[PDB]
């Protein structure tokens, strides 16, 4: 997102505003006119692409409504401040720093990193329905699990991996217990 | 759900793993930490677009 | 499949180690473990 100081009201704010948003979901839920979409968002100067080089010269805020405005239950995590007044750009959503494999991990923030790596690798070899049409196609070593199930704990990003339409595993009632020693 | 993004050759699905390389045309300097008489090298690898 | 499509390779400064510039460009989590660790990258 492109943050702009220039405003009728006070401090800096993201250019994207609710109006644009509803103007998008109008498109999504619809399928009125001209189909306001990503290209539009990019032409209107709301969102901008940035490489690693240009990344040198800018300053980024993690969350829009946390870190944009100037100014606590014990459960929530501890955060930094808004003291920087110069934010040029604000991150869309931080989770997007994860690749595809990690995206399937729930709560990866709460895991020690190597367990994220090992999951990134193992998740590649799991069974699960790979394509709807397997029945009509020929290739060596296809594997399909009879009854796939979409996970109860989900990551929002799974919506865009089609992971709820092609689930790789089964929810199973699981107890952590030292039982028979087996 | 098929994503495309690959080639079919001889009835097998091939993909190109993105190959990586260092930018061309950018000046770079580096220390030589060894007895070699060169204290600093300035490399530039030049190639047409 | 998807993670395989996006997968990016580095032919053989310590390259394997995750570098600050990778913020938001390359997955910090997903890497192969082995001889190729950190040389393979995911978008």
């Amino acid at each position: 997102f492109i943050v702009e100081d220039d405003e009728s009201l006070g401090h800096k704010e993201l250019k994207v505003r609710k109006g644009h948003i509803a103007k998008l979901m109008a498109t999504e839920y619809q399928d009125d006119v001209e189909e306001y979409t990503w290209s539009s968002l990019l032409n209107e100067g709301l969102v901008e692409y940035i490489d690693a080089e240009e990344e040198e010269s800018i300053l980024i805020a993690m969350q829009p409504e946390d870190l944009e405005p100037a100014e606590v239950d014990p459960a929530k995590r501890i955060r930094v401040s808004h003291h920087a007044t110069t934010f040029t750009h604000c991150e869309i959503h931080p989770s997007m720093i994860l690749g595809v494999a990690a995206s399937i991990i729930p709560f990866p923030d709460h895991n020690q990193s190597p367990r994220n790596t090992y999951q990134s690798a193992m998740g590649k070899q799991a069974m699960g329905v790979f394509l709807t049409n397997y029945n009509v196609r020929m290739d060596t070593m296809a594997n399909i699990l009879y009854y796939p199930q979409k996970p109860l704990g989900t990551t929002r990003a799974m919506e865009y991996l089609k992971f709820r339409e092609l689930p790789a595993g089964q929810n199973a009632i699981v107890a952590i217990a030292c039982y028979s020693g087996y | 759900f098929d994503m495309g993004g690959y080639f079919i050759i001889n009835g097998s699905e091939k993909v190109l793993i993105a190959q990586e390389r260092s930018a061309g045309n950018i000046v770079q300097v580096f220390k030589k930490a060894a007895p070699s008489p060169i204290s600093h090298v300035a490399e530039i690898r030049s190639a047409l677009e | 499949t998807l993670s395989h499509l996006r997968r990016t390779n580095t032919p053989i400064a310590k390259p394997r180690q995750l570098h600050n510039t990778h913020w938001g460009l390359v997955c910090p989590a997903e890497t192969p473990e082995g001889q190729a660790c950190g040389l393979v990258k995911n978008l």
């Binding site: 704010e13 993201l14 994207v16 505003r17 609710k18 109006g19 948003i21 509803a22 998008l24 979901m25 498109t27 999504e28 979409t37 990503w38 290209s39 968002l41 969102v47 969350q63 829009p64 409504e65 946390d66 944009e68 405005p69 869309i92 959503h93 997007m96 595809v100 929002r156 919506e159 865009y160 991996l161 | 994503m3 495309g4 993004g5 690959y6 190109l16 | 998807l2 499509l5 996006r6 978008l43």
Partner: peptide, 30 residues
């Protein structure tokens, strides 16, 4: 109202509008 600032949950709508356009494996195709 339309000009109000946006909440965090909102941001997801943007991302949807991103993948609708681009698709997951688009850089290869483009």
């Amino acid at each position: 109202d339309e000009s109000a600032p946006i909440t965090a949950e909102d941001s997801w709508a943007v991302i949807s509008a991103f993948f609708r356009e681009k698709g997951l494996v688009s850089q290869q195709l483009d």
